[PDB]
């Protein structure tokens, strides 16, 4: 869990490389270096991973 975050808005994946997340969900931030718009994250509880809007992720 090198870097953690908390989801701030619901987001539903519309394509394969995205990750559906719900407000309040805890994530690992896997990659916040490649894009200021899209971060690769993984849900702590389910282990599901993919791209989400950066602006929806509050780092801990």
UniProtKB/Swiss-Prot annotation:
Compartments, as annotated in UniProt: Nucleus; Cell membrane; Endosome membrane; Cytoplasm, Cytoskeleton, Actin patch
Description of post-translational modifications: Phosphorylated by PRK1.
Limits of the SH3 domain: 4-60
General remark: Present with 952 molecules/cell in log phase SD medium.
Function: Component of the PAN1 actin cytoskeleton-regulatory complex required for the internalization of endosomes during actin-coupled endocytosis. The complex links the site of endocytosis to the cell membrane-associated actin cytoskeleton. Mediates uptake of external molecules and vacuolar degradation of plasma membrane proteins. Plays a role in the proper organization of the cell membrane-associated actin cytoskeleton and promotes its destabilization.
Subunit structure: Component of the PAN1 actin cytoskeleton-regulatory complex. Interacts with ABP1, KRE6, LAS17, LSB5, RSP5, RVS167, VPS1 and YSC84.
Family per similarity comment: Belongs to the SLA1 family.
Protein's UniProt name: Actin cytoskeleton-regulatory complex protein SLA1
The organism of origin for this protein: Saccharomyces cerevisiae (strain ATCC 204508 / S288c)
Stretch of the intact protein here: 357 to 413 of 1244
